[PDB]
Amino acid sequence: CEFKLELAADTEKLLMVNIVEEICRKSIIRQIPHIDRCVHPEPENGKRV
Amino acid sequence: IVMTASAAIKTPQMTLPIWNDVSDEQADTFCKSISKVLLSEVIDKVIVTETTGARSYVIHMRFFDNNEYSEEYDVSKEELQNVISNQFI
Amino acid sequence: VRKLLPESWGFLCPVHTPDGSPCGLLNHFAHKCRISTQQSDVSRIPSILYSLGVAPASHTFAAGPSLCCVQIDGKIIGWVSHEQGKIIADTLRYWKVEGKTPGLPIDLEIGYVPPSTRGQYPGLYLFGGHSRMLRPVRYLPLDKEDIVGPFEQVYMNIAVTPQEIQNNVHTH
Amino acid sequence: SEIEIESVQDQPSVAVGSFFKGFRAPSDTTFDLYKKKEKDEFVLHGENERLEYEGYTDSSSQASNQYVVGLFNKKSIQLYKAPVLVSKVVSKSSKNLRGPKIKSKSDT
Amino acid sequence: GLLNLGVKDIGEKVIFDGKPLNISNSGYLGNKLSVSVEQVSIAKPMSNDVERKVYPSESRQRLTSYRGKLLLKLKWSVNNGEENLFEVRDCGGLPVMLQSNRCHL
Amino acid sequence: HYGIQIRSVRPDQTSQTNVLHYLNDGQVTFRFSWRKNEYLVPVVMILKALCHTSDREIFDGIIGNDVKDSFLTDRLELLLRGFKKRYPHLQNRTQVLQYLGDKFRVVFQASPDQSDLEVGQEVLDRIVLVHLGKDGSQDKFRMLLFMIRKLYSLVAGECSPDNPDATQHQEVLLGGFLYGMILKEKIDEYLQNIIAQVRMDINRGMAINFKDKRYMSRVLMRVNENIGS
Amino acid sequence: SIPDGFKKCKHLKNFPLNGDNKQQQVWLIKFPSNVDISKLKSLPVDFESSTTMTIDKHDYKIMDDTDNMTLLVPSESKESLKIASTAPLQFDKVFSVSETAKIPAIDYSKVRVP
Amino acid sequence: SVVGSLIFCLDCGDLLENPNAVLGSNVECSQCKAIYPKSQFSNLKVVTTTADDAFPSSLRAKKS
Ligand SMILES: [Zn+2]
């Protein structure tokens, strides 16, 4: 990917490697409600779950 | 469960019984539509700068090859196009 | 902290500890571990150390894990690479149990640290003052009594009886 | 190969400047040296209108760890004894001391 | 030793007064004086009614303490130390453990 | 969560504590300890306080022959900009100390005749890295320079946490040395109680001068001498 | 101008320097004082760590170090120095001379007792 | 002199502040009238890198 910002002269050097990093791990490619990961377990006692 | 007034919990959990006919090989593919994929799952490196024009800032991301996030987490440009001018920006 | 830790090889009891509430808190010392009570009162620990191949203090300006900073106990005048680190790791161990040292005392704490694992910070560390903790051991070149503390027990190892000794994987 | 020490001497008459990486040497005022004689140490001063050269030698190990400098094409080196020197250049920043305290009232 | 060398580095402490001298008529408020401690040493224990030698087991025969006794030197200064009104004062006691330096064993 | 520390020790074995703390902004601050009172401070104002280093030698201590690392320059020039924000007229160690005379006059209980240059060096050399010794002008940069390259290298990941809970990092309080610590402390409370008897007379009044030597003997024994008690 | 350096410099000498841009350039090295600047007048021209010299202590170790300092030239007497520059003045290859105080060698014979 | 994204000097031996937070074309040392920059400031080119270290996945466990 590529995108270039611009910014005024007053505001100083910032955490340019951390201005991205903490955004990525909160940014989401598809939201799905209150749910995280699905596990396929072992079958047991006449039932696949 | 007994005392702590159980609420939003450390390990949320529920059991989903699947049908008699749905396969081993189709169920897990739709388990990857369920799995909450983050946005950071597709990046090799994030090289960022602080240049000057009047201060200039170009972010030059690097991703993976296509056939992994398309493979491992069953998602592609169908929302990676519209996460990158819509959510991350 | 209440569990025994395997960095405690030979300083306190693996076996003496009460049963119940002071479990893992109070547990006495080992057999022949000792405590230093006064410094290596020489001030020639560094006076031969620049001679032996270390650059001076304020003439080069290098720092970081790329170099191994020679910490005298308190003072520093030394940083080296590892290629002079493993030399001065145990060149001392040749001088320390050798009687041609009018400045290097028998009681002195030299622990090496290499830059492996990106773990501990790279240096060449010297100690020995008040409250320094001891244990004696047999250094195998020129087999002689020699003391170490627990800071040696990271990056220089001990054999437990001379049958498990084997090629260049023990030194004591 | 091998090469030989040609010339040893008695007095070393050189020093270094251990300022920092990249002091590009304006040479707008060439300054002097103030000797010693302990053994084999030196010290220096040097004037500008707003700037003074302040440099002495490390008493911890100066003559006890003595550099020399060599010179070759001939291709045979000669020794030349080299006292190293630490330096921290100063400038005009005096006169703060007139009124350090709260001397106006100062009954607090 | 240590605590001899402990209170060695002390400088020039002060305490001041309200008695004047004669711009800086109220600047130099009075006697610039000092106080310092140069020497302190427990030596040994004793007991009397000259001095005699006490036994350490004797001191817990008596259901008491192993009372040492402690001295303390005071070095005086005033006006960059022009008259050093010196004094030496004890501080009571200080107990010592058995087989020490400054016991009888 | 970051921090590297020193339990620096006086040569009479009564210590203090000099931690760092990693301000997530991009500065970095100290911490002291006192009576029951923590005294944090920014770092450059008692970095550039020892001897005359206002040049590249501030920067050149951080690694000189490896400038090429890019965690360095974007992170050291936000702490150095975290100080030029405060007072830009501050350039030599005469002037850099002078801030201590606003705060450190009555917190280490100084004299009112002392200017700040006598006390600011004094309030420095009581509290931070004493084991490098008094007159540590060259020898308090080069510790603290190296002491801060660790903390940047402890957030950038090329280091690892230590284990204070083990014999890796254990010492002994000998018990007799501790008993020899209190007789540095309670000696300097007996000395801090004859200077709490003179001014309780002279500000009560009718306290004649010491020059007649019995003014000492009327003040040196009215205080209770109970170090042993 | 505070201290007591007891002297002010007048006695000066010359540096051999051609200024030809094969090329006489400077050569500084590092070594201690307890050395052979009085008793061994020769030392090799070697590569990275490629010697062990012979005195009564019987070890000197030329090292290299490339991966500085302004250089001063007291040409005539009253100047007491200058700063050397062709147009700072760089340099090729510095030495740091240690002493290989070795270890007693491989022995697993007596120390490995059955 | 210049390191990283910032300019030092020769007379004063040290830096100056953000050249655009104060007057461009008009800068000197912060404490002495030693105006070494002649308004030819720098080419401000810094390039940093997040090293992909706290980006957990199931597809960075394969590269390890
Ligand atoms: Zn300037």
G29 CB within 8 Å of a chain D CB: yes
Residue G11 identity (one-letter amino acid): H
* Residue of C66, C67, C63, C69 lying closest to C49 (CA atoms): C69
Q: Which helix (H) or strand (E) holds F146?
A: helix F138-155
Cα-to-centroid distance, G88 and ligand 1 (Å): 20
**Among C98, C60, C93, which Cα is nearest to C76's?**
C60
What backbone phi and psi angles, to 5 degrees, belong to C127? -140, -165
d(CA A17, CA A35): 29
Give me the CATH topology for the region F1-163: 3.90.1110
Side chain identity at residue H26, one-letter code? N
Size of interface D-H (CB pairs under 8 A): 23
Concatenated DSSP letters of F41-104: -BSGGGTTTSS---SHHHHTTS-SS----TTTHHHHHHHSHHHHTT-TT--SHHHHHTTHHHHT
Amino acid (1-letter code) at residue H14:
D
d(CA C87, CA C93): 10
Q: Which of C11, D21, B89, A31 is nearest to F168 (CA)?
A: C11
CB–CB of D2/G44 below 8 Å?
A: yes
Strand order in the sheet with D67-72: D81-82, D67-72, G25-30, G95-98, G61-62
- One-letter identity of residue E31: N
Specify the DSSP class assigned to residue B76.
-
Show the tokens assigned to F206.
Answer: 């009718």
Contact, F100 vs F116, CB < 8 A?
yes
The strand pairing partners of E88, in sequence order, are: E73
DSSP letter (8 states) at residue F169 = G
Distances (CA, A) of C170 to C139, C158, G38: 10, 6, 42
- Cβ–Cβ < 8 Å for E68, E96: yes
Q: Which long-range contacts (CB under 8 A, 24 or more apart) does D72-76 make?
A: D72/D3, D72/G24, D72/G27, D73/G22, D73/G23, D73/G24, D75/D3, D76/D3, D76/D4, D76/D6
Instruction: Name which of G69, C83, C61, C73 is nearest F149 in CA terms.
Output: C61
DSSP 8-state secondary structure symbol assigned to residue E3: T
3-state secondary structure chain G: CCCCCCCCCCCCCCCCCCCCCCCCEEEEEECCCCCCCCCCCEEECCCCCCCCCCCCCCCCEECCECCCCEECCCCCCCCCCCCCCCCCCCCCCEEEEECCCCCCCCCCCCCCCC
A16 touching chain H per CB within 8 A: yes
Determine the residue type at E76.
W
Burial of F201 (0-12, 13-18, 19+ CB in 10 A): middle
Pairing assessment for the beta strands G95-98 and G25-30 based on DSSP bridges: parallel
* Token pair for H7: 């300019």
Tokens representing C15 are: 């076996």
Alpha carbons F16 and F14: distance in angstroms, whole number: 7
Query: What gap in Å lies between CA E94 and CA E28, rounded to an integer?
Result: 41
Site of tokens 């960095």: C7
Half-sphere exposure of F166 (CA within 13 A, CB side): 15
In chain D, the N- to C-terminal Cα span, in Å, equals 78
Q: What angle do CA F5, F8, F9 make, to 5 degrees?
A: 160
Location of structure tokens 């029951």: F36
Query: Which residues contact residue E24 at a Cβ distance below 8 angstroms, ignoring those fewer than 6 apart?
Result: none
Q: List the domain boundaries for chain G.
A: 1-114
Contact D3 G31 (CB under 8 A): no
Helix H, strand E, coil C: the string for A1-49 is CEEEEEECCCCCCCCCCHHHHHHHCCCECCCCCCCCCCCCCCCECCECC
Distance CA D98, CA E55 (A): 65
For residue F142, the CA-to-ligand 1 centroid distance in Å is 25
Interface test with F, best of A15, A20, A22 (most F CBs within 10 A): A15
Residue B24, classed as helix, strand or coil, is helix
Distance CA F83, CA F102 (A): 18
Residue E12 has a CB neighbour count (10 Å cut-off) of 15
Chain C residue with minimal CA distance to F14? C130
Structure tokens at H38: 């002649």
* Burial letters H15-38, b for 16+ CB under 10 A, else e: bbbbbbeeeeeebbbbbbebebbe
Contact E95, E60 (CB under 8 A): no
DSSP state string for F184-228: HHTHHHHHHHHTTTSHHHHTTS----TTSTHHHHTTTTTS---S-
CB F128 within 8 A of CB F120: no
Q: Show the beta-strand stretches assigned E in E1-105.
A: 33-37, 71-78, 87-90
Q: F156 by DSSP, 3-state: which?
A: coil
Rounded to the nearest angstrom, the distance between the alpha carbon of D88 and the centre of ligand 1 is 15
DSSP type of residue E34: E
CA of D19 to the centre of ligand 1 (A): 16
Say which amino acid occupies B46. V
C-alpha dist (Å) from residue E44 to C48, C144, E65: 43, 41, 14
Q: Quote the ligand 1 centre to F54 CA distance (angstroms).
A: 11
Q: CA E54 to CA E37: how far, in whole Å?
A: 29
Contact between G111 and C143 using a beta-carbon 8 Å cutoff: yes
The C-alpha torsion from D22 through D24 and D29 to D34, rounded to 10°, is 30
Token code pair at residue C102: 């009018």
CA–CA gap between residue F69 and residue F16 (Å, rounded): 35
* Per-residue b or e along C142-168, where b marks 16 or more CB atoms closer than 10 Å to that residue's CB: eeeebbbbbbbbeebeebeebeebeee
Residues 6 or more apart whose Cβ sits within 8 Å of residue E83: F211
First-residue to last-residue Cα distance in chain A: 40
The two three-digit tokens of residue C82, written as one number: 């590892």
* CA within 13 Å, CB half, F77: 24
CA dihedral F143, C89, C49, C150 (to 10 degrees): 60
Decide: C86 and C113 in contact? Cβ < 8 Å: no
CB contact under 8 A, G24 and D11: no
Q: Residue F32 contacts by C-beta under 8 Å, 6 or more apart in sequence?
A: F16, F17, F18, F38, F39, F40, F41, F127, F128
Residue D40 contacts residue D18 (beta carbons within 8 Å): no
Cβ-nearest to F228 among E15, E78, E93: E93
Q: Give SS3 for B78.
A: helix
Contact B88 A23 (CB under 8 A): yes
CB hemisphere CA count around H48 (13 angstroms): 27
Query: Does residue B48 sit in helix, strand or coil?
Result: strand
Token output for E87:
């004094």
Q: Give yes or no for a contact between H5 and H44, defined as CB atoms under 8 angstroms apart.
A: yes
Token pair of C72 as six digits: 């005298």
List the CATH number of the domain containing C58: 3.90.1070.20
Q: Are H39 and A7 within 8 A, CB to CB?
A: no
Distance between CA G20 and CA G15 in Å, rounded?
Answer: 14
The rounded distance, in Å, linking the Cα atoms of E38 and F168 is 39
DSSP annotation of E64 reads S
Cβ within 8 Å of residue F54, ≥6 positions away? F48, F91, F92, H13, H14, H31
Q: Which of A12, A21, A30, A42 to mutate to test the interface with B (most CBs of B within 10 A)?
A: A30
| Annotated binding-site ranges of H for Zn(2+) | 9, 12, 29, 32
Q: Structure resolution in Å?
A: 4.0
Chains with 3 or more CB pairs under 8 A to chain A: B, F, H
The residues near E1 (Cβ < 8 Å, ≥ 6 apart) are: none
Listed residue (B37, B15, B14) closest to B83, CA to CA: B37
Cβ atoms of G69 and G88 within 8 Å: the answer is no
Sign of the four-CA dihedral B74, B79, B81, B83 = negative
**Secondary structure string (H, E, C) spanning chain C:** CCCCCCCCCCCECCCCCCCCCCCCCCCCECCCCCECCCCCCCCCCCCCCCCCCCCCCCCCCCCCCCCEEEECCCCEEEEECHHHHHHHHHHHHHHCCCCCCCCCCCCCEEEEECCHHHCCCCEEEEECCCCCECEEEEECCCCEEEEECCCCCCCCCCCCCCCCCCCCCCCC
Is-contact F186 F225, C-beta < 8 A?
no
Helix pair angle (F187-194, F176-185), 10° resolution: 10
Q: Tell me which residue in F52, F57, F94 faces D97 most closely, judged by beta carbons.
A: F94
Q: How far is E2 from F170, CA to CA, in rounded Å?
A: 23
State how far the Cα of D33 lies from the Cα of G74, in Å rounded to an integer.
10
H/E run at residue F30:
strand F28-31
Record the tokens describing residue E28, joined without a space.
Answer: 């130099």
Rounded to an integer, what distance in angstroms lies between the CA atom of residue D87 and that of residue D20? 9
Instruction: Name residue, tokens 């010179």.
Output: D71
First to last CA, chain B: 42
DSSP class of E89: E
- Identify the three-state secondary structure at position D28: coil
What is d(CA D36, CA D47) in angstroms, rounded to the nearest whole number? 20
- Give the closest of F26, F77, F81 to A15, CB-based: F26
